[PDB]
């Protein structure tokens, strides 16, 4: 399956947290292609900004093997 | 394909291929040569299958080729036949693969959404595929026809 | 966010209390509001058709839909029309809001990078957006059309 | 995570079915959410629930 | 503002704005002009409101402006008045927005923590806001005052 | 992933061409090889633990790596290295059945070089281990199977 | 209803109703009497609206009342008219409620699935509703018609 | 779930006995029936939408249920009922291939009565619908297949009632 | 069994059985009669297979039947042979099922844990199974042996 | 990690058993330890004040706090003082440990990148850290101050 | 070492070190000098401890040094003794650290996997460690022995 590597930052506008939040704040992750759409929207709705998107696995414009 | 499906299940389980899985692969490779011939037959008869099925569909559904209907007009009728041709090509691919997965990616995912935007009636499309199956079955030998039927049935089920 | 909030935010960074000039901009928005609401209702009702017409104008009967084209295969076709829907919905939101920011925060952010990885053609997408704009313009009527057009153009410029 | 997603009892039996998943997490290339997704999308989950 | 809130709910649902939601937007835009006038009144009277409220606060709390107290000294007293001015500016922003959200982001989140580091007493700050409310109410007409009161009350509630 | 059969299909699908005899011949070629591959896969699965043991003995152990200050020193690191070896073996077996190198690219090969460089794992030693596994595998599978098995092992090595 | 919607939003926020929200409730209760009259008008004209709309629909779509078509035959034609009547009743309910929710629960959720089993064409149903709207609009006064139109439009949007 | 082949195996495993000729004959019996079952399953899958339509027409629609105040009144409820019908059909097909009723018990039958009672869905009407589906299915599958298909449909009906 | 596996995959996907899946079922039912005979052969030769394999294992691993070793002593040696018998019974079950699932539930899940508590060496157990395979292969015809081999290999892989 | 573990790790890579020279380094740490514990207790008790004083020295009465500044708005102000607390707590941990590694593993890693995305000014933050150091130096007293200073400087250099 | 443990607990709680925790650190630093002496004693006796333990192990387990067994042959026997030496070195490190963590990272994580690839029996390894403990205990004074025993016991528990 095609996979997306995504780097995104989400700021904690609702409440300040004492424990280290660095992993939550700035995260690079591998997303299944199907999941990414929903995830992208969720980051937008949070007000986080998606710094970088790349397709980790799979071939661009593939009819099959997707 | 059969093999792709088996590998994928194994990878999810993070295990080597199970004996049963291996056996199915063995059966498939033996079947393949026969499958290739079945596919070849349909390819040669493709033009006639589409034509005959189209006529049957239009007889079954006068409405589709009527001023209201989507199929109506030369441009539209051509597109309807082109669609039937597409599905036949997909079915041939399926027979050689031994699995519907190749068919499924190209044709069956998002099909509802595409046709709804077009406003083409999905049941009529299904009837066309059924019609194609009947034509294809006649040209194929009985055992060959049964194999081909499964793929045709899947398409009808999908839409 | 919103035209009203945009004015507020600009003043807040300055630290200035709201002033008459600012108030006038807010007043301008309030008059435009009623028109915008009517336009939004029109778009929502005709959304499916708008997409259909725009696709017919640009996307379909094209190389894209033909085999080897980006929008070939049902899956890709469905994806493209889904994207078209989002552009329309967000543009409607922007028109009500009176602010382009939501487009930047929601639609525009991460789109270019996604499209480049996918190999989706930006110019064709822009073409589709412009087509939607034209269809929308008709339905909404002239006064509403001018307002609607700016948000569509904003989306197009972002994608390009 | 094993104990949340499977129950306590089933989580005990796990030896290393998910070792590959663990490594991606250890590497910090997947998030915890993603790791939980994949535990859910697993033959073991399906077999047990 | 109200409009932003409506858009946000729609986006979460991934749906076009409901007729009811649209109606609320219409009502808000009509109300806005009245709201602008209320805000304008307070802005003009801002300097006096702050001054009067400050005096009341210092009378109510001698301690804050005492050698021990945080407010004591010219520099410190100015800062205390500056804070009162800030809160008034936020209130005006709120009235035009029709929501406390603008107020809330700038002034009410982390306020406790900020003041605790400063060592400023939170209750005294609340009293100052209450004092400002009373002054503002007098200048405003009764119905206008009620609208303004809500925003003032929210601030007092937030800083508690 | 992709296999041989699907690869042919996909190439035809982008062309839009129906399957033709030349294509059929490639498929037929695969079908003959298939039976051999299945037998090889079963052999590898049964002897997997030993294959890894032998390969480690040939390259990894009795070496500076295992000695203190070496990458594979400490139980934790030793265990990691043999886990990686197992991965390579399992994926190569999958690839051999499939008749396509793509799965190796999609799972194993992508990002491995970068991971190893950050970790400070030595690539050349890893490659050596893969080559050793290939040699052991070659023996067990037998000559006809060995040629097929070798290409996937070489593919992994080249990627790393 | 409008009030139910407001309460639900408050409950989600876990707060008492806002003054603004309360004001909207007040406006709605005032509007209700006018709304009741609009609903009453349509109820009285119900029989004729359905009849006229049916005829228009059948003219617009000859196919539906053709031997192939679903609507064809007395039994079937009656059922098609009964459906139109149902939708009109729902619209009246909506007008009094001031919200589409009553309409939505009874008629628009699972509608696609129900009609697909029946094999009734959804677009034709939408046309029938559009036809009913036009008849209803003529009997209603202009401002009344606009109110009624919104509910009619929603139905058309839902069945798409 | 369990199937016929596994059921035989499991019975022997608890005994600890190696497979015996009597056991083998039961397995052999299943193997002959198997080919018929596969054909039946394909027929059902292709005609599933129609089967549901016909069965609904026979029992559910044109009835008080569909009329206002009936359980299947409103689009939402109508859609739910046909979804349930589809479930029953799919599971019955699975059971027919398997040659064992157990899957029905494990997935469909367990907790259904309680769910329906809380919902206020009428059990007897549902049973009626299942019986109707059986009749339609019987026609399509043909006689040899019909007997096999019928037992699973009857099993569902008995469970619900 | 094959059929159980197919049904389970379908249910997860919430779909009717795919044509490919159906085809595998068809192949299995045809194979079954042959499979039954293969199983019958091994059952009859069971006693000798176990005996021969045991001897081979003990030759291969002197240690297991040594004072230190787990197998040492009559009681222990009997238990080791009983275990070999158990695995053979499981393999026969597998052949008729056409899948390792029946084998897997009874024998392969928790096997490591059980043997670790017992302190029995897992590799030695695997060798015994390998030994049984060789004996079984000799009695079976070549094609029959290949089928049986797959199940034997799975067991060896599992431990 | 810790001074004690650092010595151990250096020996482990060499593979050497612990030697007197190594022991002497450990002994050196043990003498310093008592002082460090006293310093840590002082810092913990005065932590709130330390932050207050440092903020007064650098952060407040500045453009940052004024509208349009990074620390403007209550939320941002609170965030900045939270960050200051983090630095203080970690520096205290490092001082007890006698090793800078913890700072690298928790505080220093990824902070620069986070700050750049946020638009927080690094130089101002560094200024704040230096201010805290000065305040801390006073409270801890001279012997403790030297030890405390190195960790503060390490944080500053990293940022 | 212990201090690391204390810091880690504090960091999890996000608090400064508790007085009680600080006191334990103080006690540990005082104890360290005594601990160093205990470690020194074992280091000096290391060569003899390993030799004696090896002999005991081989007597206890004839099989390991038998043609089938892993330990059999000079090369292999040396490696088995080297392993025993490694574990002793780890134990000394543990005593000075006051925690098993140093021991654990180097020797106890992945140990099962490493030995399983080697095919060495884990229980025999445990017996060797037990044997080493007995020899070490005899040379150590009673209180010193108890301290050393804990670390030895942990190893035995880990490899089990
Ligand atoms: C204060 C001396 C200066 C300042 C600080 C500042 N920081 C933020 C926001 C964040 N800071 C961090 C950093 C960390 N998270 C961690 O886990 C650690 C190490 C343990 C650090 C140091 C993070 C993650 C944020 C984001 C908020 C959150 O809680 O997730 C701000 C606010 C900016 C914003 O938009 O969030 C500020 C002001 N900036 C200055 O101007 C001071 C000089
Ligand atoms: C024939 C059975 C029915 C019918 C067909 C019909 N189709 C169109 C238009 C299109 N059909 C497709 C179909 C596909 N594109 C793909 O990539 C695939 C998967 C391989 C398929 C099946 C597409 C993309 C189009 C859009 C036009 C284009 O290709 O550029 C029409 C015309 C409708 C229109 O307005 O364009 C018609 C009529 N119509 C019926 O009612 C028949 C039952
Ligand atoms: C249609 C006008 C053109 C087109 C579109 C197209 N898009 C994809 C795939 C994706 N598009 C997006 C875009 C978005 N995700 C979001 O969150 C938003 C904001 C709401 C947008 C606009 C994403 C994330 C994907 C990936 C997965 C998904 O389906 O969402 C495709 C498919 C490409 C592929 O290789 O699969 C297509 C075709 N391309 C055209 O041909 C038109 C010009
Ligand atoms: C007056 C009612 C009380 C009072 C006030 C007081 N405040 C300070 C110092 C500061 N107050 C603030 C507050 C804000 N900055 C913001 O950005 C916002 C949100 C818009 C607020 C409310 C800040 C940040 C400071 C620091 C200085 C600066 O910003 O330039 C002081 C001085 C104390 C000091 O150490 O700085 C005082 C006296 N004190 C009372 O006791 C009164 C009840
Ligand atoms: C053995 C031949 C060599 C070796 C191995 C080694 N690898 C790691 C660490 C990692 N290995 C991977 C790789 C994979 N993860 C996967 O999911 C897959 C695909 C199936 C692979 C191949 C990853 C991601 C890591 C990092 C995370 C983890 O710990 O798992 C190490 C550990 C390095 C360390 O410092 O911890 C080692 C030792 N190194 C050698 O010495 C051999 C040459
Ligand atoms: C008329 C515009 C179209 C048309 C109508 C048509 N409908 C039926 C049958 C039914 N339609 C419904 C609909 C509803 N039931 C509800 O609960 C609601 C919401 C309150 C609706 C809208 C139902 C349930 C039926 C089934 C009949 C029954 O009560 O049992 C038919 C008859 C077809 C049949 O086989 O029953 C027809 C003709 N047909 C068209 O094609 C027109 C476009
Ligand atoms: C149709 C023959 C009858 C009917 C059905 C009906 N069902 C519901 C609601 C539910 N149905 C189920 C049932 C199942 N879930 C399962 O897991 C299984 C076993 C495989 C079954 C059969 C469930 C759980 C629901 C509730 C949740 C949902 O809707 O998905 C309704 C709707 C009831 C309501 O009041 O909303 C109906 C109408 N009712 C009839 O009239 C027929 C007799
Ligand atoms: C002796 C008690 C038992 C025994 C020992 C044995 N070990 C090996 C081979 C190796 N042992 C290790 C172990 C370690 N590496 C580490 O980093 C640590 C912790 C510090 C340990 C304990 C390694 C790496 C090897 C591999 C060879 C090498 O030195 O690089 C053997 C040889 C077997 C083989 O296949 O190599 C033996 C015999 N085995 C027994 O039978 C005793 C009970």
* Smallest Cα distance from H5 to chain B, Å: 15
Chain G CB contacts of H49 under 8 Å are 117
CA atoms within 13 A on the CB side of F103: 28
* Pair A62, C119: CB distance under 8 Å: no
Residue C142 at interface with chain F, using a CB cutoff of 8 Å: no
CA distances B86 to B83, B103, J131, Å, are 5, 10, 74
Distance CA H113, CA H104 (A): 14
3-state secondary structure string across chain G: CHHHHHHHHHHHHCCCCCHHHHHHHHHHHHHHHHHHHHHHHHHHCHHHHHHHHHHHHHHHCCCCCCCCCCCCCHHHHHHHHHHHHHHHHHHHHHHHHCCCHHHHHHHHCCHHHHHHHHCCCHHHHHHHHHHHHHHHHHHCCHHHHHHHHHHHHHHHHHCC
User: Long-range contacts made by residues I6-12, C-beta under 8 angstroms, separation at least 24?
Assistant: I6/H97, I7/H1, I7/H3, I7/H94, I7/H97, I7/H98, I7/H103, I8/H1, I9/B9, I10/H94, I11/H94, I11/H107, I12/D46
Q: What would the two tokens of residue I72 be?
A: 């040492």
Pairwise CA distance, residues D23 & D11, whole Å: 18
How far is the C-alpha of G93 from the C-alpha of D42, rounded, in Å?
A: 48
**Cα separation of K132 and K88, whole Å?**
8
Quick one: residue J15, left, alpha or beta (phi over 0 = left, psi -120 to 50 = alpha)?
left
Q: What backbone torsions phi and psi does residue A50 show, to the nearest 5 degrees?
A: -90, 105
- Atom in ligand 6 nearest the alpha carbon of residue G107: 19
In DSSP terms, A7 is beta-bridged to A28, A52
Distance CA I1, CA I87 (A): 18
Structure tokens at D45: 């989950």
With breaks defined as C to next N over 2.5 Å, after which residues does chain B break? Answer: none
Instruction: Give the integer Cα–Cα distance in Å for H30 and H148.
Output: 11
Tell me phi and psi for residue A9, to 5 degrees: -115, 130
What string of DSSP letters covers K54-79?
A: HHHHHHH-TTTTSSSSTT-SHHHHHH
Closest CA to G57 of G133, G114, G115: G133
What is residue E14's DSSP assignment? T
Find, among J74, G17, A15, the residue nearest to E159 by Cα: J74
Residues of C in contact with A52 (CB under 8 A): 113
Is-contact F19 B93, C-beta < 8 A?
yes
3-state secondary structure of C63: coil
- In a 3-state reduction of DSSP, which class is residue A8? strand
Distance from residue H78's CA to the centre of ligand 4 (Å): 64
Q: Helices G122-139 and G46-60 sit at what angle, rounded to 10 degrees?
A: 130
Longest Cα–Cα distance of chain K, Å, equals 60
SS3 I66: coil
Beta carbon of F80 within 6 Å of any ligand 8 atom: no
State whether residue G160 sits within 8 Å of chain C by CB.
yes
Task: Name the β-bridge partners of A26.
Answer: A9
Closest Cα partner for B130 from F13, H138, H47, G119?
Answer: H47
Residues contacting ligand 7 via CB (< 6 Å): H 65, 71-72, 77, 80-81, 84-85, 87, 107-108, 112, 115, 119, 121-122, 125-126, 129
Burial of residue G82, with CB atoms counted within 10 A of its CB: 0-12 exposed, 13-18 middle, 19 or more buried: exposed
Q: How far apart are the first and last CA of chain I?
A: 21
Q: Pick from H97, B45, B96: which is nearest to F31 by CA? A: B96
Structure resolution, Å: 2.8
- Look at residues H8, H21, B23 and name the one whose alpha carbon lies nearest to residue I41: H21
Distance (Å, whole) CA I108 – CA I99: 13
Place of tokens 């409620």: G97
DSSP for I82-147, written as a single string: HHHHHHHHHHHHHHHHTSSHHHIIIIISSHHHHHHHHT--HHHHHHHHHHHHHHHHHHS-HHHHHH
Q: Strand, helix or coil at A9? A: strand
Breaks (C-N over 2.5 A) in chain E follow: none
- Measured CA to CA, the distance from residue J111 to residue J129 in angstroms comes to 14
User: At A28, is the secondary structure helix, strand, or coil?
Assistant: strand
CA distances from I148 to H106, I91, I96, J80 (A): 32, 8, 10, 70
Question: Could you list the residue range(s) of the whole structural domain that residue F40 is in?
Answer: 1-160
Among the listed residues F40, F82, J90, G151, the one whose alpha carbon sits nearest the alpha carbon of residue B16: F40
Reduced to 3 states, what is the DSSP secondary structure of residue A27? Answer: strand
CA distance between the termini of chain C: 23
How many Å from the N-terminal Cα to the C-terminal Cα in chain B? 21
Q: Which two tokens stand for residue E26?
A: 């219409």
Instruction: Indicate whether residue F50 lines ligand 5 (CB < 6 A).
Output: no
Cα separations in angstroms, G67 against E54, G61, G76, G120, I89: 86, 13, 11, 14, 66
Segment holding A54, helix H or strand E: strand A49-57
Q: Which two tokens stand for residue I41?
A: 């052969």
Which experimental method was this entry solved with? cryo-EM
Spatial distance between the Cα atoms of I29 and F84, rounded to a whole number of angstroms: 40
Cα torsion F94, F96, F98, F103: sign: positive
What is the residue whose two structure tokens read 């699932």? I101
Provide the b/e sequence for A1-40 (b: ≥16 CB within 10 Å). Answer: ebbbbbebbbeeeeebeeeeeeeebbbebbbbbebbbebb
Does residue K66 come out as left (phi exceeding 0), alpha (psi in the -120 to 50 range) or beta? beta
CB burial string C83-120: b at 16+ within 10 A, e below? bbbbbbbbbbbbbbbbbbbbbebbbbbbbeebbebbeb
| Gap between the terminal Cα atoms of chain F | 20
Q: Are J108 and J159 in contact (CB under 8 A)?
A: yes
Whole-number Å distance between alpha carbons of K119 and K114 = 8
Residue I19: CB atoms within 10 Å: 26
- Regarding chains E and B, contact by 3 or more CB pairs under 8 A is answered as no
- The DSSP-derived string for H106-123 is IIIITTHHHHHHHHT--H
What values do phi and psi take at K18, rounded to 5?
Answer: -70, 155
In angstroms, what CA-CA distances link F65 with F52, F78, F124, J11, K115?
16, 9, 12, 17, 17
The H or E element that residue A30 is part of is strand A26-32
Residue of F nearest to C71 (CA): F14
Q: Which helix (H) or strand (E) holds F66?
A: none
Picking from C87, A31, B30, the residue whose alpha carbon sits closest to that of residue D31 is A31
Kindly report the number of other CB atoms within 10 A of residue I155's CB atom. 28
Q: List CB contacts of H71: < 8 A, sequence separation 6 or more.
A: H65, H77, H81, H120, H121, H122, H125
Q: Tell me the DSSP string of B92-127.
A: HHHHHHTSSHHHIIIIISSHHHHHHHHT--HHHHHH
Cβ(I136)–Cβ(I42) below 8 Å: yes
SS3 for F67? coil
Nearest C-alpha neighbor of F2 from the set F74, F73, F107, F72: F107
Mutate to test the pocket of ligand 6, among G55, G68, G70 (most ligand atoms within 8 A of CB): G70
Distances (CA, A) of J14 to E59, E157, F76, J11, J17: 75, 65, 18, 5, 9
**Long-range CB contacts (within 8 A, 24+) of J121-127:** J121/J64, J121/J70, J122/J159, J124/J58, J124/J59, J124/J64, J124/J70, J125/J83, J125/J159, J126/J156, J126/J159, J127/J58
Distance CA H140, CA H42 (A): 11
In the DSSP assignment, the letter for residue E99 is S
Find chain E residues with C-beta within 8 A of G19's C-beta.
Answer: 150
DSSP C69-117: STT-SHHHHHHHHHHHHHHHHHHHHHHHHT-SHHIIIIIITTHHHHHHH
CA angle H66, H72, H77 (to 5 degrees): 135
Cβ-proximal residues to I157 (8 Å cutoff; 6+ apart), any chain:
B16, F45, F46, F48
Q: Which DSSP state fits C56?
A: I
Q: For chain J, give me the number of helices (H) and strands (E)?
A: 8, 0
Cα(H12)–Cα(G155) distance, integer angstroms: 62
Cα(I42)–Cα(I48) distance, rounded to whole angstroms? Answer: 10
Which residue from F43, H10, H22 is spatially nearest to I90, judged by alpha carbons?
Answer: H10
Assign B1 to helix, strand or coil.
coil
Q: What residue has token string 């069971």? A: I46
Inform me whether the C-beta atom of residue A47 falls under 8 Å from chain J C-beta atoms.
Answer: no
Measure the CA–CA gap between E93 and K20, rounded to whole angstroms. Answer: 51
Cβ H9 vs Cβ I93: under 8 Å: yes
Does B have 3 or more CB contacts under 8 Å with G? yes
- Number of H helices and number of E strands within chain B? 8, 0
Strand partners, A29: A6
**Where do we find the tokens 């509007």?**
G31
Q: Are the Cβ atoms of F45 and I153 closer than 8 angstroms?
A: yes
K63 is in an annotated binding site: no
- Residue G83 CA: which ligand 6 atom is closest? 22
Cα F6 from chain centre: 20
Structure tokens of K104? Answer: 């654990």
Which tokens sit at B119? Answer: 């406003």
Bridge partners, J80 (sequence order): none
Distance CA(E115)–CA(E91), nearest Å, equals: 19
Contact I49, I57 (CB under 8 A): no
What sign has the CA pseudo-torsion C15, C19, C22, C23? Answer: positive
**Total number of domains in chain C:** 1
Q: How far is F45 from chain I (nearest CA, A)?
A: 6
CATH of the domain at H61: 1.10.490.20
Q: Would you give the DSSP letter of residue A16?
A: -
H137 CA from centroid of ligand 6 (Å): 25
Distances (CA, A) of C125 to I13, J32, J149: 34, 68, 58
Strand order in the sheet with A49-57: A26-32, A3-9, A49-57
The SS3 of residue A4 is strand
Please list the residues that pair with A52 across neighbouring strands.
A7
Residue A62 DSSP class: -
Q: Do G2 and E19 touch (CB under 8 A)?
A: no
Is residue E92 helix, strand or coil? helix
User: In terms of Cα–Cα distance, which of H106, H157, H155 is closest to H128?
Assistant: H157
Whether the CB-CB separation of K59 and J53 falls below 8 Å is answered with no
**Two tokens, residue A29:** 């992750």
User: J41, K19: Cβ pair inside 8 Å?
Assistant: yes
Of B109, B151, B121, B118, the residue nearest B57 (C-alpha): B121
Q: Which of H121, H32, H114 is nearest to H85 (CA)?
A: H121
Torsion angle, alpha carbons of G32, G37, G39, G40, to 10? 140
Cα angle at J119 between J113 and J123, to 5 degrees?
Answer: 80
């Amino acid at each position: 399956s095609r996979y997306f590597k995504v780097t995104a930052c989400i700021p904690s506008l609702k409440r300040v947290r004492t424990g280290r939040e660095l992993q939550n704040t700035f995260f690079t992750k591998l997303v299944p292609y199907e999941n990414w759409f929903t995830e992208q929207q969720r980051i937008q709705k949070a007000g986080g900004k998606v710094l970088s998107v790349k397709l980790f696995t799979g071939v661009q414009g593939a009819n099959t093997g997707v | 394909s059969v093999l792709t499906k088996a590998i994928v299940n194994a990878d999810a389980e993070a295990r080597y291929l199970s004996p049963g899985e291996l056996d199915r692969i063995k059966s498939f490779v033996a079947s393949g040569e026969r499958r290739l011939r079945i596919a070849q037959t349909l390819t040669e008869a493709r033009e006639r299958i589409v034509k005959q099925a189209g006529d049957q569909l239009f007889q079954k559904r006068p409405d589709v080729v009527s001023p209201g209907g989507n199929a109506y007009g030369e441009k539209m009728t051509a597109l309807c036949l082109r669609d039937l041709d597409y599905y036949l090509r997909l079915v041939t691919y399926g027979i050689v693969a031994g699995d519907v997965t190749p068919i499924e990616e190209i044709g069956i995912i998002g099909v509802k959404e595409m046709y709804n935007s077009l406003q083409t009636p999905i049941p009529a499309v299904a009837e066309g595929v059924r019609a194609m199956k009947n034509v294809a079955t006649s040209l194929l030998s009985g055992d060959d026809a049964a194999e081909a039927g499964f793929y045709f049935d899947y398409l009808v089920g999908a839409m | 966010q919103d035209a009203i909030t945009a004015v507020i935010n600009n003043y807040d960074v300055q630290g200035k209390y709201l002033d008459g000039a600012a108030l006038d901009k807010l007043k301008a928005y309030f008059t435009t509001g009623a028109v915008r609401v009517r336009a939004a209702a029109v778009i929502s009702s005709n959304a499916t058709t708008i997409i259909k017409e725009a696709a017919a104008k640009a996307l379909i009967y094209s190389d894209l839909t033909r085999p080897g084209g980006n929008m070939y295969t049902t899956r890709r076709y469905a994806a493209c029309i889904r994207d078209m829907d989002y552009f329309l919905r967000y543009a409607t939101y922007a028109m009500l809001a009176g602010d382009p920011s939501i487009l930047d925060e929601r639609v525009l952010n991460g789109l270019k990078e996604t499209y480049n990885s996918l190999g989706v053609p930006i110019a064709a997408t822009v073409g589709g957006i412009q087509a939607m704009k034209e269809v929308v313009g008709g339905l909404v009527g002239p006064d509403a059309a001018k307002e609607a057009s700016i948000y569509f153009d904003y989306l197009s410029s972002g994608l390009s | 995570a094993y104990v949340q997603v499977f129950d306590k009892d089933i989580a005990s039996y796990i030896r290393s079915e998910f070792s590959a998943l663990e490594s991606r997490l250890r590497n910090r290339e997947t998030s915890v959410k993603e790791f939980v997704r994949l535990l859910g999308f697993s033959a073991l989950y399906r077999k047990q629930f």
